[PDB]
Design a protein around this nucleic acid. Structure first.
Lengths: 52, 225, 147, 34, 187, 49, 104, 49, 124
RNA sequence: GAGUGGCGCGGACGCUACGCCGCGACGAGUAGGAGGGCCGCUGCGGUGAGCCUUGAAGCCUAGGGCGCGGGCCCGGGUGGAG
RNA sequence: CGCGUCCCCCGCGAGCGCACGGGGUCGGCGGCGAUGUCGGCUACCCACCCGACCCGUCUUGAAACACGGACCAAGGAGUCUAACACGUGCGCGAGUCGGGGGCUACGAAAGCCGCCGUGGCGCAAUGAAGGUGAAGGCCGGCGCCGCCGGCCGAGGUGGGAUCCCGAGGCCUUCCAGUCCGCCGAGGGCGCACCACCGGCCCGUCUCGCCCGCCGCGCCGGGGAGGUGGAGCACGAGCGCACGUG
């Protein structure tokens, strides 16, 4: 119930959203993995440009 | 070489001493002149009354200029119009007293609070003991006790009220600067009446203590002061 | 910080700052934006006038890239080009005007808000306001269009 | 103040080498515990 | 029993800053002293302003200090701002000014010192003028914040030109029933 | 940037620049003073009248 | 389950807490609601005040010129009164200096 | 050193507060060399603490 | 400066010890041993210390020199005074007043020195 | 206020300026609000050259006390590793 | 209560001392003290006088013949996330922010990028939309001209904390006479902010002429006066943290 002058606002939280909450504790582990797989690719192409 | 500083700083010290003595003499002579005035005021009211009786006429004396209003009823269950007037008279507490000058605008403010106040026409001696014993000056919005004249000379001296006696003269003989000298006084924190009240609730005329006690406020000031 | 919060001070009370008479019940006005035309009409009228009803034309596959037209006012026109150009133009005798490509700095339409300092300009904009053009001409300048 | 004094460099035996560094301006930055 | 209302007996102003920053809190010690000891009412106003919130001492633009020191009988005078001095990019010529500010923005410093100007801090202003003589004390606009557009008479209440709190502005975000004669009524 | 450049407000406040432009310190302490009566204390009465 | 219908009982007490504010009677009230045909003309009367600026500014000097010649061609007891004169610092310095010299 | 001592660092014997040592110290490989250096700089009573 | 690094140290120093509604400073050159701007012994350019001797007998008076103040190992110049009470207290009075060296610690230093001399005196 | 003219080597206390001092008035309180806690619990970063098998925590206590109170500190008993 | 001087009516003397004098001192004393005595306020028990109904709760009203509670231990109830608003703290400031990506034990941290600001939010609004999109005056070339140029050029009134000038004046057996400072009649520039009055932008309506031109048109642009706008009128925002709703 609206108190006084405030923003009229509609949260999209009516579905079972807590089953599908993607957290990002992977983030630094992902970045380490992508960087190791990028260095590992760059070493396989010995003379060739690493970027592609 | 200091001999001139030493001598100069002693002359300044001395110039303020002779200046005190001159003020101390003025304050002495002002009070001596006031003693002469109160004699003549008291004696003329007799003199006028007598020559009227000698003729076989009447001398109706002046309706009094100066009342001493004491609050006799407490803070609980008071009408809004009565609340407002009692706090315009600075009677915000039971057995608080203020000097009020009588005119048409004041007497209709004292009938509007009649049940809640006991007022009269205070004596000269009533104005003395109230200003001496109970006299607290409102100095920098603070209730400070009138222990030296220079408390009264620093607030009221611009109205030529430079001592205790000048204040008493300005109240009793309702002067041109009565308003400022009376607002300078804090409302008098009086004690409960010793020997008791007759009856708080009812008016003085019907054997109570509320309303106008013309000569008779001075019996209760001496009781409460 | 849970220790700075109000809940800590309300240990030992009873109602927890929510009323002894009108209990803290769950949803006693309905949930969310419920009753905006009924029991909450005055809030939605006093504070949100226009909330209910249709107005204007639908535009189905609106693409915000088409209507993209970032605007620069004349008052900040000389910030697009280095302060060296503003100095050296006023010094140099030729009457030669430095070119301000409004599109390079990342604006399309030149609007005419402020006083423009009295030296010639060649503003290469995509669009111009009328007043924007008049000022550039008035100072003694050109308005080049571009695409 | 503004001034940056002359900071000495100590040898492995804990005694002052002839070499000096001018105190970097970082060490005269404002101290904010806030 | 005294009939007093204690509702307003506590005055709700600042005795000190809410901040724990020491450099401000040393400038307060300096102006605690100067305010009460000097007879100058300037130092009272500076001390009072060192207490005030970020929002109560808003930023004064270079161009207002240009403008408010262009005023007659104000030449060779120090512009005192208890807030911060921001650079104004839509001003070309900047004269030589004497400025006191808690903060001057790096672009405004450059701009003032290039025009043969001088920048003081409150510590220097004390040593330069203890009683704050030969000063123009200025303030930034306090109704500058967007916050103040939402304040006053509620929108949907006739002759209120008060910005509503709308999620996002468009042609179907609070334009209908309380806004037009067509869609019911207009305030 | 520094909010103040001379943090030493020992040296600031006792500088002649500032020490010139003060009023004198009111270091004399004034405790309350007891009321004495009209008719009771004779020389308290003589101090007023 | 009948209840109380209407009262105005505590209301006069509630109104007087934050005072009953008389409206903030500011000077120069707005010209809203003043008749359009008159408000049109008054706006024109303000628009053309530039016209009679020279006629007005020169006429201010002629009112000052009348005043330039109008300033040019213009040019209780005995003891208490005496003791009040001696008592107060400024006017009674010499009266008190003689009391100090009188006791030599 | 006012603030470094207030942090509790035993630095009484320490020659200068922004203690700066040679670039030879980078080339140290044994802890025997590192421990010996702190005895000479007189930072060791900070480790002993 | 002193006034700045007081505003850092005033509450959060290692030498600071709050308990039993009392505040103390265990700093190696504070004479009244109390958390105070004046008495703090790390923060000023001029500092008077008074400690008992390296032996059992006498008082050491720690003057902090004017010059190397980023230089802790040479900043404090210590002088042992092992004399009779009246002359130990006199030397400290002369050091502080007649060098003008932090002359508002003149009496705290004497009272401390007096209480150290009392301490290293055999019990009855 | 300032410039040219007519012997004995001495003096309490203070000012954690977020401190210290002075003077005045005042003090009901539900729902409720706000503030300050050197009130208390558990963990983390710092810190106290902290404490502790010459006895930690816990517990008991007609013991000695402190604080307006939340609480806390000491004594004595028990206990055995924080 | 010296007198050197002024005319109507006829600038510092030295001591001492007493105190109804800016909140109590005594330069007065006397008892008692080792196995029965002293102190210990609080705490343990007991007695007596006065007061004194049982808490929680809903309630106009509870000791209620209203409900819950036999007793004790331990557990046990405004949380976290998202959004928003306002307040506050900090950084930078017409900007601001890497948060995604990338580069280089604690470290899954921290540091760095700038041709990684893509992008967000702010810097411009207004209209349903096509769209349009935020000061002018004066002096001349042809008492009034479409446009030639010329120069100063972002309002006005009122109240406004602060500052500015300073008629006069604040003392040494005099009187000139500066420099330093300070007070002040009166006079000003006036911050923010408030009210009012103008102006400008957008929509819309009314009246009304006059410009423009690669395509002279059911074209384009301008004016005056009302009116709708969440505008302009020498920026305040952004990020972060905390509080409250």
């Amino acid at each position: 119930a609206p108190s006084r002058n405030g923003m009229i606002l509609k949260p999209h939280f009516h579905k079972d959203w807590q089953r599908r909450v993607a957290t990002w504790f992977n983030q630094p582990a992902r970045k380490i993995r992508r960087r190791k797989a990028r260095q590992a690719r760059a070493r396989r192409i010995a003379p060739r440009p690493a970027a592609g | 070489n200091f001999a001139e500083l030493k001598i100069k700083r002693l002359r300044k010290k001395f110039a303020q001493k002779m200046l005190r003595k001159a003020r101390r003499k003025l304050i002495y002579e002002k009070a001596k002149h006031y003693h002469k005035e109160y004699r003549q005021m008291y004696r003329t009211e007799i003199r006028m009354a007598r020559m009227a009786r000698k003729a076989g006429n009447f001398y109706v004396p002046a309706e009094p200029k100066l009342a001493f209003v004491i609050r006799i009823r407490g803070i609980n269950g008071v009408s809004p119009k009565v609340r407002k007037v009692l706090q315009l008279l600075r009677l915000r507490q039971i057995f608080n007293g203020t000097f009020v000058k009588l005119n048409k605008a004041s007497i209709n403010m004292l009938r509007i609070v009649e049940p809640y106040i006991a007022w009269g026409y205070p004596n000269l001696k009533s104005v003395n003991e109230l200003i001496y014993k109970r006299g607290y000056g409102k100095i920098n919005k603070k209730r400070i006790a009138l222990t030296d004249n220079t408390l009264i000379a620093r607030s009221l001296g611009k109205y030529n009220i430079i001592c205790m006696e000048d204040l008493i003269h300005e109240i009793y003989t309702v002067g041109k600067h009565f308003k400022e000298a009376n607002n300078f006084l804090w409302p008098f924190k009086l004690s409960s009446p010793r020997g008791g009240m007759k009856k708080k609730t009812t008016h003085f005329v019907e054997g109570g203590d509320a309303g106008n006690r013309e000569d008779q406020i001075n019996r209760l000031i001496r009781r409460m002061n | 910080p849970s220790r700075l919060r109000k809940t800590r001070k309300l240990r030992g009370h009873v109602s927890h700052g929510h009323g002894r008479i009108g209990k803290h019940r769950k949803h006693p006005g309905g949930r969310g934006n419920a009753g905006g035309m009924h029991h909450h009409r005055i809030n939605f009228d006093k504070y949100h006038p226009g909330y209910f009803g249709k107005v204007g034309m639908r535009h189905y596959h609106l693409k915000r890239n088409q209507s993209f037209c970032p605007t620069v006012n004349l008052d900040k026109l000389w910030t697009l080009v280095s302060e060296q150009t503003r100095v050296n133009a006023a010094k140099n005798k030729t009457g030669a005007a430095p070119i301000i490509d409004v599109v390079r700095s990342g604006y399309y339409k030149v609007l005419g808000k402020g006083k423009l300092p009295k030296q010639p300009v060649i503003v290469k904009a995509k669009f111009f306001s009328r007043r924007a053009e008049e000022k550039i001409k008035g100072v003694g300048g050109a308005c080049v269009l571009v695409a | 103040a503004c001034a940056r004094p002359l900071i000495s460099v100590y040898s492995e035996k804990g005694e002052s080498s002839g070499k000096n560094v001018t105190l970097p301006a970082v060490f005269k930055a404002p101290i904010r515990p806030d | 029993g005294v009939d007093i209302l204690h509702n307003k007996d506590r005055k709700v102003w600042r005795k000190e800053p809410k901040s724990q920053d020491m450099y401000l809190r040393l400038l307060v010690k300096l102006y605690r002293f100067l305010a009460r000891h000097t007879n100058s009412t300037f130092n009272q106003v500076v001390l009072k302003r060192l207490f005030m919130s970020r929002t109560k001492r808003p930023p004064l633009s270079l161009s207002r200090v240009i403008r408010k020191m262009k005023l007659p009988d104000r030449e060779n005078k120090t512009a005192v701002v208890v807030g911060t001095i921001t650079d104004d990019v839509r001003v070309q010529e900047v004269p030589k000014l004497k400025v006191c500010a808690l903060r001057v923005t790096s672009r405004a410093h450059s701009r003032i010192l290039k025009a043969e100007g001088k920048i003081l801090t409150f510590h220097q202003l004390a040593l330069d003028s203890p009683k704050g003589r030969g000063t123009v004390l200025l303030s930034g606009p306090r109704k500058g914040r967007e916050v103040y557009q939402h304040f006053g008479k509620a929108p949907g209440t006739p002759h209120s030109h008060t910005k509503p709190y709308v999620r996002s502005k468009g042609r179907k975000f609070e334009r209908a029933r309380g806004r037009r004669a067509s869609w019911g009524y207009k305030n | 940037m520094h909010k103040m450049l001379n943090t030493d407000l020992s040296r600031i406040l006792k500088s002649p620049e500032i020490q010139r432009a003060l009023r004198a310190p009111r270091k004399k302490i004034h405790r309350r003073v007891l009321k004495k009566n009209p008719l009771k204390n004779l020389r308290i009465m003589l101090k007023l009248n | 389950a009948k209840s109380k219908n209407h009262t105005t009982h505590n209301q006069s007490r509630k109104w007087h807490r934050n005072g009953i504010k008389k409206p903030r009677s500011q000077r120069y009230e707005s010209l809203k609601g003043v008749d359009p045909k008159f408000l049109r003309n008054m706006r024109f009367a303000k628009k053309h005040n530039k016209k009679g600026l020279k006629k007005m500014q020169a006429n201010n000097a002629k009112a000052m010129a009348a005043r330039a010649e109008a300033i040019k061609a213009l040019v209780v007891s005995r003891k208490l009164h005496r003791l009040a004169y001696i008592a107060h610092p400024k006017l009674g310095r010499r009266a008190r200096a003689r009391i100090a010299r009188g006791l030599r | 050193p006012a603030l470094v001592m207030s942090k509790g660092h035993r630095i009484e014997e320490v020659p200068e507060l922004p203690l700066v040592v040679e670039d030879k110290v980078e080339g140290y490989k044994k802890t025997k060399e590192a421990v010996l250096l702190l005895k000479k700089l007189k930072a060791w009573n900070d480790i002993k603490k | 400066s002193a006034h700045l690094q007081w505003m850092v140290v005033r509450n959060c120093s290692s030498f600071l010890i709050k308990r039993n509604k009392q505040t103390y400073s265990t700093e190696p050159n504070n004479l009244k041993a109390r958390n105070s701007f004046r008495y703090n012994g790390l923060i000023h350019r001029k500092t008077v210390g008074v400690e008992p001797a390296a032996d059992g007998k006498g008082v050491v008076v720690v003057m902090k020199r004017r010059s190397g103040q980023r230089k802790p190992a040479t900043s404090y110049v210590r002088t042992t005074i092992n004399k009779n009470a009246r002359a130990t207290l006199s030397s400290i009075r002369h050091m502080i007043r007649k060098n003008k060296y932090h002359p508002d610690l003149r009496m705290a230093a004497i009272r401390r020195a007096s209480a150290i001399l009392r301490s290293q005196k055999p019990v009855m």
